[PDB]
Design a protein around this ligand. Sequence first.
Ligand SMILES: COc1ccc2c(c1)cc(C(=O)NS(=O)(=O)c1ccc(C(F)(F)F)cc1)n2CC(=O)O
Ligand SMILES: COc1ccc2c(c1)cc(C(=O)NS(=O)(=O)c1ccc(C(F)(F)F)cc1)n2CC(=O)O
Ligand SMILES: COc1ccc2c(c1)cc(C(=O)NS(=O)(=O)c1ccc(C(F)(F)F)cc1)n2CC(=O)O
Lengths: 276, 276
Amino acid sequence: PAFHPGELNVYSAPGDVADVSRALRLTGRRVMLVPTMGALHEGHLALVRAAKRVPGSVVVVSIFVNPYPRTPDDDLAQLRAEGVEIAFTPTTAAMYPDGLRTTVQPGPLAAELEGGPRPTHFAGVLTVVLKLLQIVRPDRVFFGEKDYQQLVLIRQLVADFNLDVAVVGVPTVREADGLAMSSRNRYLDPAQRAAAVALSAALTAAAHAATAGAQAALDAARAVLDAAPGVAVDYLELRDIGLGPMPLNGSGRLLVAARLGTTRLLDNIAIEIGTF
Amino acid sequence: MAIPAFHPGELNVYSAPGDVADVSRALRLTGRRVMLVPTMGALHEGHLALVRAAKRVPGSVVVVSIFVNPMQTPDDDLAQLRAEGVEIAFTPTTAAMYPDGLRTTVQPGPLAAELEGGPRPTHFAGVLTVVLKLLQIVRPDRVFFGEKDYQQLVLIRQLVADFNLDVAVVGVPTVREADGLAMSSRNRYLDPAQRAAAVALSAALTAAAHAATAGAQAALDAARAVLDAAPGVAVDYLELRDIGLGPMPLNGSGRLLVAARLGTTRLLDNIAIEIG
Ligand SMILES: COc1ccc2c(c1)cc(C(=O)NS(=O)(=O)c1ccc(C(F)(F)F)cc1)n2CC(=O)O
Ligand SMILES: COc1ccc2c(c1)cc(C(=O)NS(=O)(=O)c1ccc(C(F)(F)F)cc1)n2CC(=O)O
Ligand SMILES: COc1ccc2c(c1)cc(C(=O)NS(=O)(=O)c1ccc(C(F)(F)F)cc1)n2CC(=O)O
């Protein structure tokens, strides 16, 4: 396959990107992977920028939706402007020629929180991520921290399968009021958008409240969520940073998921208890 | 950062996954092609054939792993490897392989529920997980298995296809005793009557293969007849399938697989079949 350095090369076939990726690595370049479902926003640009600041790196951004917002004219233009040299955009047929066959079965974390009502959801995420990792074989792969449980499951996948890639979590880029960036924010009417600030407001309230201990942190977050119109909370949980089965100590992660109309929003934050 | 000690032309034993990973990387960067022979130790002639097939690749360095998977002849095994010119034995502990215990695993496609998956329903999940791990630690160019456990071999090829692994899977024809009995650690348990009756499995299969000019029913009936002539041979299945273990086509290449119990020992064998 042709590679044009300092231009955006778009590859469809896993074979093409795999050969280009390996050739590059051989000539000393480090391969950075940013896996996406497209519909790119500023948080993705932050993943790319962090990937680009890795010296001698070549950046690969993949755009692929398993089997939703699909806007690839926008997606590609942004990459060219950030100076990304590789977009990997495979077909479903190329990723899944045999359909669903060999799969990743996540540990029990995958049955908690987001996984509780969606029992195969993380199996599907870990299977596609493993496949992207094997196609591309990057040195480092980048994720936003907003989908924190998913990021922890990925660290599990990488440890548990001895995968030779460094996983980089990048702090969640926010709108000016604190709203975690998300593709799905577009689905909020003006009143829902106004109210949605409560998730991030609740979590920062909790993070400062936590000097007074874990119950006070939780109750602060809960009062903010309850003060907000049309916000229905699925969960609000405080956990170890690995998300269990450890009891929380002095440091943890506070996670929330809520529905505004039909739109589910997630957010999370670091929390120190007895602030520390 | 510093590569662990490796001495070309002799036997280098590592028990730490990170060490073998580092040696193997260092080796392929200097030209060598890395060949992986996974074993559970207690080496026999079947393993020495996997080994000889590996050594014959120009520029090969040979990694034999020795690992008994609880989820699935010592200084002696190592002596055998030395006498074969094997340069790397990988001998990890259970703790090294599973430092976080059992967590993320491989879930096999539906083939794992058939045939051997009938008696042992999660056996292949355990095999595919350890094989994925060994492949990721060693990162070989080629990996060598006997054709004796044929279903296991097909499932591994599904693993490799499905997860986009960049390794070649090499199946090496089954090594057999003088009378045709497929080498197996279990053979030494058979008393003389069982041992004499056991020849029926390979006898049935070769008869079928030669009968196949007369078609599929003729092949199967010949095999059955031969099995029916043996006392104490309790056949769990005798099945003709295509080379991928889906259903046998009209006419073309196939595989005939058999499994049976003699006293307390379970024996398997299989053979290439050509219809017509
Ligand atoms: C650095 O700041 C941010 C903030 C939010 C982010 C991101 C970065 C990245 C995402 C995100 O979800 N991207 S995405 O859905 O295309 C995505 C989804 C799933 C996976 C995974 F793990 F399966 F490969 C990767 C990217 N998201 C959240 C989102 O768009 O909902
Ligand atoms: C906890 O309650 C449930 C309900 C349904 C479940 C399960 C659990 C588990 C499965 C399941 O494992 N399905 S299956 O084909 O293994 C599977 C595995 C992986 C994927 C994925 F997401 F990778 F694509 C889909 C289905 N399934 C789907 C099934 O058994 O067909
Ligand atoms: C070239 O011909 C042969 C003939 C028989 C063989 C072999 C090769 C290899 C074996 C064998 O099982 N080796 S082993 O159990 O130590 C083994 C077990 C499991 C795996 C796997 F796939 F999990 F990686 C590999 C080797 N066996 C059968 C046995 O020893 O029971």
